């Protein structure tokens, strides 16, 4: 029960012997020191006795309140769910640690005195933004970048899985990483396949639900957002889509850019906040790179810049391998056509021909999937 | 050779810990007690002595006294208001207006006075704990430090050079330049050194749903502020808590103006802070309006820019002594290449050419593994570099 | 039928609203009007059927 944290020796040695069988001998002392109380103590039996006490001096009605300031000699003011807030004393079975302003406790009914403490059941955004499971296949199913992803692995997996060769350089790891290029050229699939890779806990927001409403609503969401990336433990915190805050504008926003531009003044803080940051890895992604505040994008606030260019065909064949390999494809199909076919296709050009041949395989209920479904299937996808 | 019998003896002795930590009584994991070895003290004496003979006492609010007789008024948080009284425990000396005070819910009077509330968003922003940045960490403006330092100490640290000379020391004082410059990081050395309550603000935590709203979370600020004996009070990112007024047609931003209008109030006019320093702290200055860049707010007007030469060899020197490197480099080639450039993007060229060394096997990086992180990150990165609209401050 | 007279002397009984139950046979019950309840149950109600 978290008895010892020393267990470096590892082997069989003698530190082990001596040690484990150090608080061995204290077990042998513990177990025949409490032996001698079921042995030799018949006035109270103290496994429930005292607990039943316990639950005698609290009454059944627990009544349920919300702390706003303490006092140390066991004595605060608390508020009731009406409003109507008393002076009411605590109880020395409240162990008085889980006690912050704003926590919800357990009153007496009759002279409201603080019985207990309560677990939060959470608030529902901490799930609604987190993410649960992995995602999809790993950096495998990506194929023809081979860079990058030596970059962003550089940048967040190597600092997590080996934190040795940091500190035998004496460094730090690289902050902060923005991702960009044309659309469709695989941005999010390669934070899928980080969300695949990490051990640490995943968050993802969409950086157009930035925006509120209200007013200073989106600033206070981003304050609880990093609080709540900062209060787990090692995490990455992924958005998409950042060029939407400053492109777009809605009649929801009751502010108008001058309510966006204080966002990203709050934002601008908790990128690079005086406070001690702690774990928290960062990962943006947009297509319009010219759009935003360098200053946002300056060192310091994000250290890596990663370009994706567009596919060489080279490339673009290997797509075709991966989105066409458990398909039965027949062999009337010539990939080598499908490439040139379009010259700037992206990655999710092929996946989206590849998918909607398949449906015309479907619409006459075939199992192979031949020439003329690609022949009228880049009809359907490219030109309307 | 006692390969099972080292680890069935160590398995049943690491069971039987629990197995008499079961009868030790740790178990029954809670929703909000405590364990059952700590509070057994009140066990029958205060389980009937804090409970049976004592109250319930509900706080309240004080509107009014009257001449001649307590005979007070009260207040409470929904109900009704009453004539109140005294206790016996209590004099009639501290019973001033406008205070909350503990009454009991039969005779409904005065048992003991309350602290004012504090509204605790504002007390979340109070620091509690100091950041580790020391002033050598801040090297290449030195005189900045120095004209900073004599305004933001040395009257806390000796408040009798300036009384035996018979001077007034400053009380405001802005920092402002490009970003990246040092101004936060410089900021955390000052709450590094001082010992009074540095309460920290950033500006865009103030804009508020309701009206005039944030305008009493700055009364309260500057409430709390007066409490304490000596206060520092920092703010960061003032351009979102205000620009300048300018309205026209449908009236827009008003709601930031009258929070900043609030704070003119509080800095100036009919009776000074006394013994509160402030710290702002901006990107552009040229927004700002001018009276709040009247002195007697914002005395000193410490800019920041780039590092002339030394200056950037000595973040060199700061940002580059603790890492493997080759013994026989020289900086002064860098500080050479790197002639508009801040201490965060020579950080970056410190960070990224220890990765260059990180990249095929080595240990120790070298002169052109920096000459490999000057071109990128000064020339391929150079494509935004965030300075140069920021030099003219639009 | 004449049992009524007394039976009808009693009080009223409550409504109210689990949230979700805890340890030791007690549960977390808010009524709409007023605050969340710790209470216990009754024998003859399964916390699994809660
Ligand atoms: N190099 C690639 N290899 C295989 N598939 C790819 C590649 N690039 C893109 N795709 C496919 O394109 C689809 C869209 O990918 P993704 O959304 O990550 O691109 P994006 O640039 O993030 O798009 P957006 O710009 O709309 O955010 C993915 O499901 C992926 O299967
Ligand atoms: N003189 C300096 N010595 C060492 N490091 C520096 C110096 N100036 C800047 N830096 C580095 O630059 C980074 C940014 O510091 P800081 O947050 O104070 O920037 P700033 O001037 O406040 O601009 P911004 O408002 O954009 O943050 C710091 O992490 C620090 O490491
Ligand atoms: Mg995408
Ligand atoms: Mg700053």
Same mark, same amino acid.
């Given at each position: 029960?978290?008895?010892?944290?020393?267990?470096?020796?590892?082997?069989?040695?003698?530190?082990?012997?001596?040690?484990?069988?150090?608080?061995?001998?204290?077990?042998?002392?513990?177990?025949?020191?409490?032996?001698?109380?079921?042995?030799?103590?018949?006035?109270?039996?103290?496994?429930?006795?005292?607990?039943?006490?316990?639950?005698?001096?609290?009454?059944?009605?627990?009544?349920?309140?919300?702390?706003?300031?303490?006092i140390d000699d066991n004595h605060a003011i608390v508020s009731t769910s009406v409003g109507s807030e008393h002076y009411v004393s605590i109880l020395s079975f409240v162990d008085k640690d889980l006690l912050e302003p704003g926590c919800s406790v357990l009153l007496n009914h009759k002279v409201h005195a603080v019985i207990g403490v309560l677990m939060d059941d959470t608030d529902p955004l901490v799930t609604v933004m987190k993410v649960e499971k992995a995602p999809q296949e790993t950096y495998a199913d990506i194929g023809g970048l081979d860079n990058q992803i030596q970059e962003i692995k550089e940048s967040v997996e190597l600092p997590l899985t080996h934190p040795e060769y940091y500190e035998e350089m004496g460094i730090k790891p690289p902050k902060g990483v923005i991702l960009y290029g044309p659309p469709g050229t695989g941005k999010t699939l390669l934070?899928?396949?980080?969300?695949?890779?990490?051990?640490?806990?995943?968050?993802?927001?969409?950086?157009?639900?930035?925006?509120?409403?209200?007013?200073?609503?989106?600033?206070?969401?981003?304050?609880?957002?990093?609080?709540?990336?900062?209060?787990?433990?090692?995490?990455?915190?992924?958005?998409?889509?950042?060029?939407?805050?400053?492109?777009?504008?809605?009649?929801?926003?009751?502010?108008?850019?001058?309510?966006?531009?204080?966002?990203?003044?709050?934002?601008?803080?908790?990128?690079?906040?005086?406070?001690?940051?702690?774990?928290?890895?960062?990962?943006?992604?947009?297509?319009?790179?010219?759009?935003?505040?360098?200053?946002?994008?300056?060192?310091?606030?994000?250290?890596?810049?990663?370009?994706?260019?567009?596919?060489?065909?080279?490339?673009?064949?290997?797509?075709?391998?991966?989105?066409?390999?458990?398909?039965?494809?027949?062999?009337?199909?010539?990939?080598?056509?499908?490439?040139?076919?379009?010259?700037?296709?992206?990655?999710?050009?092929?996946?989206?021909?590849?998918?909607?041949?398949?449906?015309?395989?479907?619409?006459?209920?075939?199992?192979?999937?031949?020439?003329?479904?690609?022949?009228?299937?880049?009809?359907?996808?490219?030109?309307? | 050779?006692?390969?099972?019998?080292?680890?069935?003896?160590?398995?049943?002795?690491?069971?039987?810990?629990?197995?008499?930590?079961?009868?030790?009584?740790?178990?029954?994991?809670?929703?909000?007690?405590?364990?059952?070895?700590?509070?057994?003290?009140?066990?029958?004496?205060?389980?009937?002595?804090?409970?049976?003979?004592?109250?319930?006492?509900?706080?309240?609010?004080?509107?009014?006294?009257?001449?001649?007789?307590?005979?007070?008024?009260?207040?409470?948080?929904?109900?009704?208001?009453?004539?109140?009284?005294?206790?016996?425990?209590?004099?009639?000396?501290?019973?001033?207006?406008?205070?909350?005070?503990?009454?009991?819910?039969?005779?409904?009077?005065?048992?003991?006075?309350?602290?004012?509330?504090?509204?605790?968003?504002?007390?979340?922003?109070?620091?509690?704990?100091?950041?580790?940045?020391?002033?050598?960490?801040?090297?290449?403006?030195?005189?900045?430090?120095?004209?900073?330092?004599?305004?933001?100490?040395?009257?806390?640290?000796?408040?009798?050079?300036?009384?035996?000379?018979?001077?007034?020391?400053?009380?405001?004082?802005?920092?402002?330049?490009?970003?990246?410059?040092?101004?936060? $990081?410089? !900021? =955390?050395?000052?709450? #590094?050194? &001082?010992? +009074?309550?540095?309460?920290? /603000?950033?500006?865009?935590?103030?804009?508020?749903?309701?009206?005039?709203?944030?305008?009493?979370?700055?009364?309260?600020?500057?409430?709390?502020?007066?409490?304490?004996?000596?206060?520092?009070?920092?703010?960061?990112?003032?351009?979102?808590?205000?620009?300048?007024?300018?309205?026209?047609?449908?009236?827009?931003?008003?709601?930031?103006?009258?929070?900043?209008?609030?704070?003119?109030?509080?800095?100036?006019?009919?009776?000074?802070?006394?013994?509160?320093?402030?710290?702002?702290?901006?990107?552009?200055?040229?927004?700002?309006?001018?009276?709040?860049?009247?002195?007697?707010?914002?005395?000193?007007?410490?800019?920041?820019?780039?590092?002339?030469?030394?200056?950037?060899?000595?973040?060199?020197?700061?940002?580059?002594?603790?890492?493997?490197?080759?013994?026989?480099?020289?900086?002064? $080639?860098? !500080? =050479?290449?790197?002639? #508009?450039? &801040?201490? +965060?993007?020579?950080?970056? /060229?410190?960070?990224?050419?220890?990765?260059?060394?990180?990249?095929?096997?080595?240990?120790?990086?070298?002169?052109?593994?920096?000459?490999?992180?000057?071109?990128?990150?000064?020339?391929?990165?150079?494509?935004?570099?965030?300075?140069?609209?920021?030099?003219?401050?639009? | 039928?004449?049992?009524?007279?007394?039976?009808?002397?009693?009080?009223?009984?409550?409504?109210?609203?689990?949230?979700?139950?805890?340890?030791?046979?007690?549960?977390?019950?808010?009524?709409?009007?007023?605050?969340?309840?710790?209470?216990?149950?009754?024998?003859?109600?399964?916390?699994?059927?809660?």
């Amino acid at each position: 029960a978290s008895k010892l944290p020393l267990v470096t020796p590892h082997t069989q040695c003698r530190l082990k012997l001596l040690k484990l069988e150090r608080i061995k001998d204290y077990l042998l002392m513990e177990e025949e020191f409490i032996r001698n109380q079921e042995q030799m103590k018949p006035l109270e039996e103290k496994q429930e006795e005292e607990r039943s006490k316990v639950d005698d001096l609290r009454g059944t009605p627990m009544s349920v309140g919300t702390l706003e300031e303490i006092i140390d000699d066991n004595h605060a003011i608390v508020s009731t769910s009406v409003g109507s807030e008393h002076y009411v004393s605590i109880l020395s079975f409240v162990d008085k640690d889980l006690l912050e302003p704003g926590c919800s406790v357990l009153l007496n009914h009759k002279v409201h005195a603080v019985i207990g403490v309560l677990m939060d059941d959470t608030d529902p955004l901490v799930t609604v933004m987190k993410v649960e499971k992995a995602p999809q296949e790993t950096y495998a199913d990506i194929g023809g970048l081979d860079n990058q992803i030596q970059e962003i692995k550089e940048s967040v997996e190597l600092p997590l899985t080996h934190p040795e060769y940091y500190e035998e350089m004496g460094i730090k790891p690289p902050k902060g990483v923005i991702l960009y290029g044309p659309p469709g050229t695989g941005k999010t699939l390669l934070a899928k396949a980080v969300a695949n890779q990490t051990s640490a806990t995943f968050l993802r927001v969409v950086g157009s639900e930035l925006i509120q409403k209200y007013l200073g609503d989106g600033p206070k969401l981003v304050r609880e957002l990093f609080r709540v990336a900062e209060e787990h433990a090692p995490s990455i915190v992924f958005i998409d889509e950042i060029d939407a805050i400053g492109t777009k504008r809605y009649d929801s926003n009751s502010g108008g850019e001058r309510e966006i531009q204080r966002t990203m003044l709050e934002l601008l803080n908790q990128l690079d906040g005086f406070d001690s940051r702690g774990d928290v890895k960062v990962i943006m992604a947009t297509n319009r790179i010219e759009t935003l505040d360098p200053a946002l994008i300056r060192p310091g606030r994000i250290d890596r810049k990663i370009e994706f260019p567009l596919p060489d065909e080279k490339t673009k064949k290997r797509i075709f391998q991966i989105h066409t390999s458990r398909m039965t494809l027949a062999d009337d199909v010539t990939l080598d056509d499908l490439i040139m076919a379009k010259d700037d296709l992206s990655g999710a050009d092929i996946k989206a021909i590849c998918t909607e041949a398949g449906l015309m395989a479907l619409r006459e209920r075939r199992m192979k999937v031949t020439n003329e479904d690609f022949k009228k299937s880049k009809e359907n996808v490219l030109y309307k | 050779t006692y390969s099972r019998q080292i680890k069935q003896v160590e398995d049943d002795i690491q069971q039987l810990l629990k197995k008499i930590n079961e009868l030790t009584g740790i178990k029954e994991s809670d929703t909000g007690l405590a364990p059952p070895a700590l509070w057994d003290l009140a066990a029958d004496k205060q389980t009937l002595q804090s409970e049976q003979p004592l109250q319930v006492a509900r706080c309240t609010k004080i509107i009014n006294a009257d001449s001649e007789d307590p005979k007070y008024i009260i207040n409470v948080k929904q109900f009704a208001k009453f004539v109140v009284d005294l206790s016996d425990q209590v004099a009639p000396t501290d019973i001033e207006e406008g205070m909350r005070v503990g009454v009991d819910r039969n005779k409904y009077q005065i048992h003991i006075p309350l602290p004012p509330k504090i509204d605790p968003t504002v007390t979340m922003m109070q620091v509690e704990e100091k950041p580790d940045v020391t002033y050598s960490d801040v090297g290449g403006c030195k005189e900045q430090i120095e004209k900073l330092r004599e305004v933001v100490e040395t009257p806390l640290l000796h408040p009798e050079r300036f009384v035996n000379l018979g001077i007034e020391p400053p009380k405001g004082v802005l920092l402002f330049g490009p970003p990246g410059t040092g101004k936060t $990081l410089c !900021a =955390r050395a000052v709450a #590094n050194r &001082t010992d +009074a309550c540095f309460i920290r /603000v950033i500006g865009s935590e103030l804009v508020q749903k309701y009206v005039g709203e944030g305008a009493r979370m700055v009364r309260e600020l500057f409430e709390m502020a007066r409490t304490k004996k000596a206060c520092l009070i920092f703010f960061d990112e003032i351009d979102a808590i205000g620009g300048a007024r300018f309205d026209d047609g449908a009236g827009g931003d008003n709601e930031v103006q009258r929070t900043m209008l609030e704070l003119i109030n509080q800095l100036d006019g009919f009776d000074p802070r006394g013994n509160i320093k402030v710290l702002m702290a901006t990107n552009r200055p040229d927004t700002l309006d001018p009276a709040l860049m009247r002195p007697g707010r914002l005395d000193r007007k410490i800019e920041f820019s780039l590092p002339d030469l030394e200056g950037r060899t000595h973040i060199f020197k700061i940002h580059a002594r603790s890492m493997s490197v080759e013994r026989d480099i020289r900086f002064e $080639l860098l !500080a =050479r290449l790197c002639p #508009n450039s &801040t201490g +965060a993007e020579i950080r970056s /060229v410190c960070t990224e050419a220890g990765m260059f060394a990180i990249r095929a096997r080595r240990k120790i990086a070298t002169e052109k593994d920096f000459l490999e992180a000057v071109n990128k990150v000064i020339k391929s990165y150079a494509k935004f570099s965030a300075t140069p609209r920021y030099m003219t401050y639009n | 039928l004449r049992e009524e007279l007394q039976l009808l002397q009693e009080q009223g009984s409550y409504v109210g609203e689990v949230v979700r139950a805890m340890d030791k046979k007690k549960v977390l019950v808010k009524v709409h009007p007023e605050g969340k309840f710790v209470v216990d149950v009754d024998k003859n109600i399964d916390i699994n059927d809660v």
